[PDB]
Amino acid sequence: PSRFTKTRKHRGHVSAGKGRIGKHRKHPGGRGMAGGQHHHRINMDKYHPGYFGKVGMRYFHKQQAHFWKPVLNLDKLWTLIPEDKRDQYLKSASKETAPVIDTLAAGYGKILGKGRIPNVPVIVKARFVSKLAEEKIRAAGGVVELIA
Amino acid sequence: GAYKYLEELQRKKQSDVLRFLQRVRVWEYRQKNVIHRAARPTRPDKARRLGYKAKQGFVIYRVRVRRGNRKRPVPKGATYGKPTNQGVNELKYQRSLRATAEERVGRRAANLRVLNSYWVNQDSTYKYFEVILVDPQHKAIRRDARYNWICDPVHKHREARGLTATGKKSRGINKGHKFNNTKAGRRKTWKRQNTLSLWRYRK
Amino acid sequence: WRKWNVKVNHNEKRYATASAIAATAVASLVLARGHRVEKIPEIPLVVSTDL
Amino acid sequence: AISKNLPILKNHFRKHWQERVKVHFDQAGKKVSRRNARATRAAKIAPRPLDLLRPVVRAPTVKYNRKVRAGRGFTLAEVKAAGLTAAYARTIGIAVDHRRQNRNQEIFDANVQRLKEYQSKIIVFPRNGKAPEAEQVLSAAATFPIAQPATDVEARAVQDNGESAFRTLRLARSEKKFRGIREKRAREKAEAE
Amino acid sequence: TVKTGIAIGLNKGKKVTSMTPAPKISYKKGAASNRTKFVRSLVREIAGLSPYERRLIDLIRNSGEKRARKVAKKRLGSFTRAKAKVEEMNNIIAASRRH
RNA sequence: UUGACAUUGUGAAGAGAUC
RNA sequence: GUUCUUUGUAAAGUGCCUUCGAAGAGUCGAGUUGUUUGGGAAUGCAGCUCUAAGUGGGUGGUAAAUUCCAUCUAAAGCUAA
RNA sequence: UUGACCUCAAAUCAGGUAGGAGUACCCGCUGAACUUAAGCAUAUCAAUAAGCGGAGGAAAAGAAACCAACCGGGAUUGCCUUAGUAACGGCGAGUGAAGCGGCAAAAGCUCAAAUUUGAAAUCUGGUACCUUCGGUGCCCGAGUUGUAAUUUGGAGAGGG
C-alpha cells in the first residue's frame, strides 16, 4: 500500500528526504560488493570476518545423499511411539516385551545421547550411534540393533 | 555374405593395396567438379549400413570441401574490440567439414533429402565425401513404409537444421553427465534455467 | 509480475470463516449491516429442509 | 555499495532478465485444460483406465532406499513368472520394462503377487463383439496401492549379549581403511626367499 | 558379496536373499565369432602390415619391447593399447620368422 | 620470413655417427 | 448396431535338448591448436597430425602404472502427449 | 560390321519437385560493444543484440556406450525441489549446473551384419479395362555391385 509509504508524506519538501548537500545520486560506492578490499574494507572486517581467501580441500561432484545422517537425541526417541500406545509402554515396562523403535522409518540417521530417557527397556534400531547414546540406552535396560 | 570382407579391407587404409587405390581415386575426383553426380557408391557396404538401398530414388553425390581452419573474415585483421576477441587466424568453425558437405549438396538438389554421408578420401587441400540423398517425390519411396518418413515436411533440409548423424555430434547431443551443457539443445536449456518462474502465489 | 494474489495460512483462513459463521448469530451484528431482521422469528434462522 | 551489517546477497540479475520472466497466470486455466484432456481421453480410450500397472520397486541411493515406490515396468522375468508373454502384457494394460533386472527375491515375490491379483480382478472383452460395458474405473493405482512392508514387530524380547554396537561400527570402520595395508604388509611377508 | 548387514565397512549394506537371473546377451558384444576369426585372418594376409607396423617389427628384432611398447604408445593413443599391439607384432614375427 | 608434420611416390652419389 | 465377405493346404504364438549367435573405422581413443563449460593435469565442439581392438570398447568428475569390481553396448534410423 | 556393357551428355523428351512470404515460439551457425569491476587488459555484459541458413502446429529431444554405489534405478520432456548448493573466477567483481525425491504426460521401435538359391519371391513407369486417395492383366525398365520375407541384442537363427 502506497498510501502508507513515507514518500507520500514527503510531498512538498524539496529534496524528498535525501538531503540537500550530498543530494542523491546514482552509485556513490560502486555497484554491489565493489571496493571490498579497498574503500569498504572497514566494513568487511567487522561483520564479514573471513570473507576473502581459501580454506581447505575442494570436493569434485559432491552429492548430499552420502552425507544424509539426521540425528535424534535421546531427548525425544519416545516421540516415535504412537501417543495412544505410548503410555502402555511406560507403565508395565518389562523385558520379553519391549517397544521396537525403527529410527530409520522416521527418517533419522543417528541416535545421539543428549539426555535422560526413562527406565523402560526399549529396542532401538539405528544405523549409527554414539558412545554415550548406547550407554544410556543399554543402562536403561534396552539394546541397540544396527541396521543398514 | 560378401560385405564382411569389404568391411575389414577398408579398415586398413595404410595397407599397401588401399594406399594405392586412395592415390588413384583422389586423382580422379580432383579432376571432376566440386559437387558432381556419383553413378554408384564407392563403398557399397558403407552406404548400405547407413540406410542406402539399390533402387530408383536413392542418389549419391560426391562433394569436395576445402580443408584447414576458418579465418574470421574482417577487413585487414582488425577486430575492433577487446584483445580477447582480437584473434583472426586460428579459429576453427564449430561445424565440421563433413556437415559443410551435406549442406552444399542439400542446396544444389533441393528436391531431395540428405540421409547421411561418409568419408571417401582426403588430401592436403581437400576432403572428399559422398552424400546419400533420397528423392521424396518419387513414387518408390513414398510407399514402402520403411522410407516414407523422409517425405514428411518436418524432415526438409535436415542438414541445415542439424538433424543428420554428423550434425547431432556437432550439436553435442548425447545422454550423460558429459553433455549436460548441450543435451536437449544448448539454447533451449540455457533459456530454461535463466527463466524466472513466478507463480501466482509466490513460493 | 506485480504480486497479484496473496497467500493466507490455511489455518488462519479457517479462523476467519469460523468467526463469520459465529457472527451470523448475535442479532445485533446483523442489523449493523442492514438486513432488516426485526420481523424474523429468531436467529439463527433454521428452515425445514424442504426448501 | 557496502553498508551497515547485512548478509551478503548473491542475486543474479546482471543479465537482461526481464525478457525471460515467465509468470504463470494460467495455473488455474491449465488445470481445467488438463482435467478436460483427461476426461476426453477417459472416454476415447473406452473402459481402459487411462493408466498401466507399475511395479513395486525399491528406491535408490543412501537416502531413499528405505521407501518403496512405483517403477516403470515389470521385468520380462517377472512377467513370464506370472504366466503371460511380454508382448501380450502390453495389451492387457501392464507396463513392461525390459532393462531392469531382478537381483532381489522379495521384490520379485512382490511384483508377481501383484500381477496375479491384477489378472484375476480384470475382465477382458472377447475380440468378437458384445462387450457388456463394465463402467471404467479410471485409476489403476486406486485399486493397486503401492504399500510399505512390515519388517519387524512392535513388541518382542530383548537379546543382550553385550556386543556394544558403537564398538562394532568402530572396528568395521577401521578394518576398511587398513585392509589394503594388510596385503602389502603380508605380500612382503610371503615373498621372502 | 554377502552384504555385511550394518551401515559401514567392507561389504556394507542390507542382507537380501538374492536371485542372479540369466545375463543379458550383450556383455557378449566382444564375442569370438568363428566366421570373424576366419575373415580377419584372410584380410591380414592380403593387406599385410602397415607402415608403422613395419617399424614395430624392426624394433622388436633390434631394440626389444621396452622401445617397442614406447613407440607404440605414441603411435597408437594409449599405453594399454600399445601392449596388445606389440603383443600382435610378436605373433607376426614369431609365427612367420620361426615356425 | 624460417623450422617441423601432412600433400609425397621411384632410387642412385657423395660426404657427416644426418645432410 | 446390422449386412456381405472365409480369407489359407496362410500366418502367429508356447516348452524341451543340440548347433550357432553375425552386432556400424580416417571412426573410438590420443597429442595438440582455438573456442567453450560449474567441469577443476583439460565439459562439449571443431581444426591439423597419429590412429585401435574383438572375453573388445566407452564410462565410473584428480594426472599415472598395477590388479580387480560395477555398468551399460558408441561411430546408422523413426516416434505421439 | 553387328550387338551388348560401363561411364558421360543433349532434348520446349513424359511426369514431378525446390526457390519467395511470415518468422512471436523452434533448429543451427556467426557474433559484439556499451556496461560492471568505483581505473583497466582476464573476467562480466554474453555463449546475449545485430548478420545468416531451416522448419512446424508445435519444433527439438527421445528408447541408454544413462544414473549410480543403493535393499539399486530404467527413453525423452516439463514443473516443484535439490540450490544460489558442489564447483569456476585479476578465488576479485561476479559466474553456477547434476543425481536422487514429489508431480504432469506416458509408447514404443526397425535398419546394416544371414544362401529364399528347387527357382528377384521386390519395385517404378507406359498401356487396357474397372468397383478410383487406389485395383487387375499385359509390355519396355530398375535391380544380383543385391530388391522383398526372416532377425535387431530384451534377443534371435537353422535344426531336431
From Swiss-Prot, chain A:
Q: Which Gene3D superfamilies does its entry note?
A: 3.100.10.10
Keywords from UniProt, A to Z, are: Cytoplasm, Isopeptide bond, Ribonucleoprotein, Ribosomal protein, Ubl conjugation
Q: Where in the cell is it found?
A: Cytoplasm
Q: Transmembrane residues, as ranges? A: none
| Residue segments, region Disordered | 1-38
Q: What is its main location?
A: cytoplasm
What InterPro entries does this protein map onto? Ribosomal_uL15, Ribosomal_uL15/eL18, Ribosomal_uL15/eL18_sf, Ribosomal_uL15_CS
* Ranges of compositional bias, category Basic residues: 1-13, 20-29
Pfam families attached to this UniProt entry: Ribosomal_L27A
GO-annotated biological processes: cytoplasmic translation
List GO molecular-function terms, semicolon-separated: RNA binding; structural constituent of ribosome
Record-listed cross-link Glycyl lysine isopeptide (Lys-Gly) (interchain with G-Cter in ubiquitin), residues: 95
Residue span of motif Nuclear localization signal: 6-12, 23-29
Q: What is this protein for, i.e. what is its function? A: Component of the ribosome, a large ribonucleoprotein complex responsible for the synthesis of proteins in the cell. The small ribosomal subunit (SSU) binds messenger RNAs (mRNAs) and translates the encoded message by selecting cognate aminoacyl-transfer RNA (tRNA) molecules. The large subunit (LSU) contains the ribosomal catalytic site termed the peptidyl transferase center (PTC), which catalyzes the formation of peptide bonds, thereby polymerizing the amino acids delivered by tRNAs into a polypeptide chain.
Q: How does it assemble?
A: Component of the large ribosomal subunit (LSU). Mature yeast ribosomes consist of a small (40S) and a large (60S) subunit. The 40S small subunit contains 1 molecule of ribosomal RNA (18S rRNA) and 33 different proteins (encoded by 57 genes). The large 60S subunit contains 3 rRNA molecules (25S, 5.8S and 5S rRNA) and 46 different proteins (encoded by 81 genes).
State what protein this is by name.
Answer: Large ribosomal subunit protein uL15
Quick one: which gene encodes this? RPL28
From Swiss-Prot, chain C:
Assembly: Component of the large ribosomal subunit (LSU). Mature yeast ribosomes consist of a small (40S) and a large (60S) subunit. The 40S small subunit contains 1 molecule of ribosomal RNA (18S rRNA) and 33 different proteins (encoded by 57 genes). The large 60S subunit contains 3 rRNA molecules (25S, 5.8S and 5S rRNA) and 46 different proteins (encoded by 81 genes). uL4 is associated with the polypeptide exit tunnel. uL4 interacts with its chaperone ACL4 and the nuclear import receptor KAP104.
Q: Which domain of life is it from?
A: Eukaryota
Could you identify this protein by its name?
A: Large ribosomal subunit protein uL4A
User: Domain note for this entry?
Assistant: The eukaryote-specific C-terminal extension harbors a nuclear import signal and delivers the ACL4-uL4/RPL4 complex to the pre-ribosome, triggering uL4 release from ACL4 and incorporation into the 60S ribosomal subunit.
**Where does this one sit in the cell?**
Cytoplasm; Nucleus
Q: What else is known?
A: There are 2 genes for uL4 in yeast.
Q: Provide the record's note on post-translational modification.
A: N-terminally acetylated by acetyltransferase NatA.
Q: Which family does it belong to?
A: Belongs to the universal ribosomal protein uL4 family.
From Swiss-Prot, chain D:
A Gene Ontology molecular function term of the record: RNA binding
User: What is the annotated localization of this protein?
Assistant: Cytoplasm
Please give the residue positions where the record annotates the modification Phosphothreonine: 143, 151
| InterPro entries assigned to the protein according to its UniProt record, in alphabetical order | Ribosomal_eL13, Ribosomal_eL13_CS
Q: GO cellular-component terms in the record? A: cytosol; cytosolic large ribosomal subunit
Give the residues annotated as coiled coil: none
What keywords does the record list, in alphabetical order? Cytoplasm, Phosphoprotein, Ribonucleoprotein, Ribosomal protein
Xref: PROSITE patterns: RIBOSOMAL_L13E
Name the domain of life.
Answer: Eukaryota
Question: Partners and quaternary state?
Answer: Component of the large ribosomal subunit (LSU). Mature yeast ribosomes consist of a small (40S) and a large (60S) subunit. The 40S small subunit contains 1 molecule of ribosomal RNA (18S rRNA) and 33 different proteins (encoded by 57 genes). The large 60S subunit contains 3 rRNA molecules (25S, 5.8S and 5S rRNA) and 46 different proteins (encoded by 81 genes).
Summarizing the function annotation, the protein's role is: Component of the ribosome, a large ribonucleoprotein complex responsible for the synthesis of proteins in the cell. The small ribosomal subunit (SSU) binds messenger RNAs (mRNAs) and translates the encoded message by selecting cognate aminoacyl-transfer RNA (tRNA) molecules. The large subunit (LSU) contains the ribosomal catalytic site termed the peptidyl transferase center (PTC), which catalyzes the formation of peptide bonds, thereby polymerizing the amino acids delivered by tRNAs into a polypeptide chain.
User: Could you say which protein family the record assigns here?
Assistant: Belongs to the eukaryotic ribosomal protein eL13 family.
Q: What is this protein called?
A: Large ribosomal subunit protein eL13A
Q: Which organism is it from?
A: Saccharomyces cerevisiae (strain ATCC 204508 / S288c) (Baker's yeast)
**Name of the coding gene:** RPL13A
From Swiss-Prot, chain E:
Compartment(s)? Cytoplasm
Q: Assembly and partners?
A: Component of the large ribosomal subunit (LSU). Mature yeast ribosomes consist of a small (40S) and a large (60S) subunit. The 40S small subunit contains 1 molecule of ribosomal RNA (18S rRNA) and 33 different proteins (encoded by 57 genes). The large 60S subunit contains 3 rRNA molecules (25S, 5.8S and 5S rRNA) and 46 different proteins (encoded by 81 genes).
**Any one GO BP annotation for this protein:** cytoplasmic translation
Q: Which InterPro entries match?
A: Ribosomal_eL36, Ribosomal_eL36_sf
State where it is primarily located.
Answer: cytoplasm
**Disulfide pairs?**
none
Print the miscellaneous field.
Present with 31600 molecules/cell in log phase SD medium.
Q: Which function does this protein serve?
A: Component of the ribosome, a large ribonucleoprotein complex responsible for the synthesis of proteins in the cell. The small ribosomal subunit (SSU) binds messenger RNAs (mRNAs) and translates the encoded message by selecting cognate aminoacyl-transfer RNA (tRNA) molecules. The large subunit (LSU) contains the ribosomal catalytic site termed the peptidyl transferase center (PTC), which catalyzes the formation of peptide bonds, thereby polymerizing the amino acids delivered by tRNAs into a polypeptide chain.
Q: Which GO terms describe its molecular function?
A: RNA binding; structural constituent of ribosome
State the GO CC annotations: cytosol; cytosolic large ribosomal subunit
Q: Which residues carry this modification: N-acetylthreonine?
A: 1
Q: Does the keyword Ribosomal protein apply?
A: yes
What's the name of the protein?
Large ribosomal subunit protein eL36A
Query: Does the UniProt entry include the keyword Metal-binding?
Result: no
- Family matches, as Pfam families: Ribosomal_L36e
- Keywords, comma-separated and alphabetical: Acetylation, Cytoplasm, Ribonucleoprotein, Ribosomal protein
